[PDB]
């Protein structure tokens, strides 16, 4: 994302593979999450993998 | 107030149940805040000070 000001936050756009209602036929899905509710997954250099 | 005009989104989580989420922000993103009148707070806190 891009706001560049710091006076306002944005919400991080995150995407995830979902177990659909017929279980084993996945489809990727996205939702907006407030930043305090999301954490990076690992100490590795990947800045694009996050965990709740 | 929260001036952001959020819009909801639905995601399926296993059979027969849904997980609601935010999917869009209509309009310009803006800051959430609370407003208190200085004219009341300034009086009130010295009133609290005497006590």
């Amino acid at each position, epitope marked *: 994302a891009t706001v*560049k*000001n710091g006076t*306002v936050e944005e919400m991080k756009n995150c995407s995830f593979n979902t177990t659909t209602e017929i279980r084993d036929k996945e489809k990727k899905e996205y939702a907006l999450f407030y930043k305090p509710d999301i954490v990076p997954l690992s100490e590795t250099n990947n800045t694009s993998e996050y965990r709740l | 107030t929260r*001036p952001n005009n959020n819009t909801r989104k639905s995601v399926r989580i296993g059979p027969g149940q849904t997980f609601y989420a935010t999917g869009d922000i209509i*309009g*310009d*993103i*803006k*800051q959430a805040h609370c407003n208190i009148s200085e004219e009341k707070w300034n009086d009130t806190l010295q009133k609290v000070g005497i006590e």
Partner: antibody
Amino acid sequence: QVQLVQSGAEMKKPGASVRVSCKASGYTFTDYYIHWVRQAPGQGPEWMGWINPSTGRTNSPQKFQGRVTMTRDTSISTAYMDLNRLTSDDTAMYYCTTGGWIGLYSDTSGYPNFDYWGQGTLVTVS
Amino acid sequence: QSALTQPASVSGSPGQSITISCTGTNYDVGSYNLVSWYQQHPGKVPKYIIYEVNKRPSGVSNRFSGSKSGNTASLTISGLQAEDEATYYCCSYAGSSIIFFGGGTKLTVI
């Protein structure tokens, strides 16, 4: 004195894209919305979108969503509209206008308060 | 009829008023106080006449006034003089960060 000036008139053949520019002097460029308004010959003006010059958010109506790209350069106080996949219906004068005041605590983007207008520049697809 | 509807033209005598109406729907004109009026003329840029449904910016002669009720707004030009002969558009907020314009209304002072 607040004033805005745009690029010059031009001829362009169908199907191409056009970069029309708008520059304003007399106020801090980041603190007022820039609204794009188009008037085809003799027709009522139609509104294309708005730009937040402070952060770069933009929005467009249903028919224009996906064929006009809008941005700006803060370093030179000049706003840019990039209409793409041109057609004959784009023959019009393109106007740059000054919108509502920008503040953190309220969304004044939708206010149709066009305080000032540019001189208008011509596109003709034929 | 461009996006909003209005009478296309009216002609009258000086001293009276030609009042131009702007119509109309719940989501555009009925919902919000954000209605403006713009005057245009052959070979001219639009002129900014009314804002926030009842206020006028500096430079607009004080013969104008604005009004609104229900789903329809109107522009009052009370005390007509031959300078007012021009094409008048209405435009307002339309929800979801969209704004709509009107079709125009020419004026005459016989």
